[PDB]
Write a structure and sequence with these properties.
The complex is a heterohexamer, with two copies of chain A and four copies of chain C. By secondary structure, chain A is mainly α. Chain A contains three helices and one strand, in the order E-H-H-H. The chains are: A mainly alpha (about 80), C alpha+beta (about 110). Chain E: Its EC number is 3.1.27.-.
Amino acid sequence: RTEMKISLPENLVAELDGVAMREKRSRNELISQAVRAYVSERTTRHNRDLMRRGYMEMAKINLNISSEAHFAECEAETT
Amino acid sequence: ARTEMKISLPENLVAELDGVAMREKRSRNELISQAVRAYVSERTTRHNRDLMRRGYMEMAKINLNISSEAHFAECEAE
Amino acid sequence: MIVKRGDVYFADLSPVGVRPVLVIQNDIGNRFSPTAIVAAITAQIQKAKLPTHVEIDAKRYGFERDSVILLEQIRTIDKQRLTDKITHLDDEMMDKVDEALQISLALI
Amino acid sequence: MIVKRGDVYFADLVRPVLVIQNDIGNRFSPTAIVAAITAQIQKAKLPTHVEIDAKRYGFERDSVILLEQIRTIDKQRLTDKITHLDDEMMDKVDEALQISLALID
Amino acid sequence: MIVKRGDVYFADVRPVLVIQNDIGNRFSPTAIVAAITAQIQKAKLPTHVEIDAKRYGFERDSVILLEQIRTIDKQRLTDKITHLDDEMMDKVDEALQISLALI
Amino acid sequence: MIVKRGDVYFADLSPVVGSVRPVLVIQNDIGNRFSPTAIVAAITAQIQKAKLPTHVEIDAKRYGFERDSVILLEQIRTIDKQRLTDKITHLDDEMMDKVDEALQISLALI
């Protein structure tokens, strides 16, 4: 449970407390939930980009071996 | 910039947060601040959309009446 | 007749009741065109219930009762239906009408 | 019902009309703000006028839009659609709506 | 070509159901599919999903065989015949976990 | 033949013998007994590290391989069990938990 020190614009905190007074939660409960959403969003997108990059690197292998074993598949069909 | 405060984030969330920091070449505060903005904008917007609906639905009786009471004037200016 | 953007008139909504109305069309067209674009005004409420509403104080603008301009209610009419010129709204009040209008018509 | 900004419908009193209200008003209010459409002119150059050639937006007729001729009626006078103007078309409309209403210069 | 998980195509000719994730279905030459047959109309296994002819535009009632899966070149995918809703894909999901012991 | 989920065999990928690639059985064990077909996932040695969340690394010394290899859970297919020849090894519960989560990602599951 690390702990830290931040500096938010005076307007943004004023607005933030607005949504707090309304949804009946605290600042930290909201900041924490906001950091989660942002970090989940960034991690996900990063992972999607690494999956693409990998698939595109693996094309030559995956294609070759998909063909090399084509006949085996076709036989295990109407069997 | 302005106010300054004290928070307690889970140890895993900050570890992950520094991950995205080391990568996008920014600081914690630059990221926390950007995150609070996005969240607050999202909440304010949705709240406003809900107040607009509620108002339109309260104003239906008036807006309808006067849209009819001035119909002919409209049709003549065609 | 010389109508100015910001003028509020009574208008005759009959084929030859009478309701207040706010001229919002540019002044060039307000001169060399038979038609005028206006925005209705009502007194069934005294407070804004929408970001498309602009309040009008009675004592400040010589109204019998406090009123609200409805920038969701706009139409173009023949200028000839404009009779009595009630008042005119200052730059302050028209800056409100401007931002309410851009919201109403998604010019944001 | 199903109304959205930039959708063109037919009217009742026959008339083609461009819907120009915000999408929020369009959903929770009985009234909708439209702009007149006419086929009498094909070209029509002037600041408050926008040009549609039919050979694009599923139109049968070369029409022109009039940001000087707008009105606000009951939602139910909007029967069935026609098409929806893409963003680039809407930008030219707004670019004239603002001139019409004196929201620039 | 944009293939989506849930799309059913003809393949080079027998029907076939795309079951691979959508990221891979875009940035990869290969697609993982599950055969479809019409020699039966009812499921004979917990690894089978029935397909109604009229509901999904088939000439005759068919059954997806989640025991019969293979990865092929997307280029063999020709005509897109239809797409299965979330309902039908929840069946394919639990049939697939059984087939591959993902309990 | 008694094939078990987790068994890795060599497979013959020819139209009859005219000579072979490693392969991982991933189908449930009931089907692996009373069915002519087996569902497998290819294995290659052209890489030694995972390049995807659909990959599972195999150490050479730990599992008796000539050279470090990677299982390709994007590459799966059902074949006739008769093409399974040599049983080279079997993977523990640890390694099969990896294959499990890699497979659910590959096929958008759970």
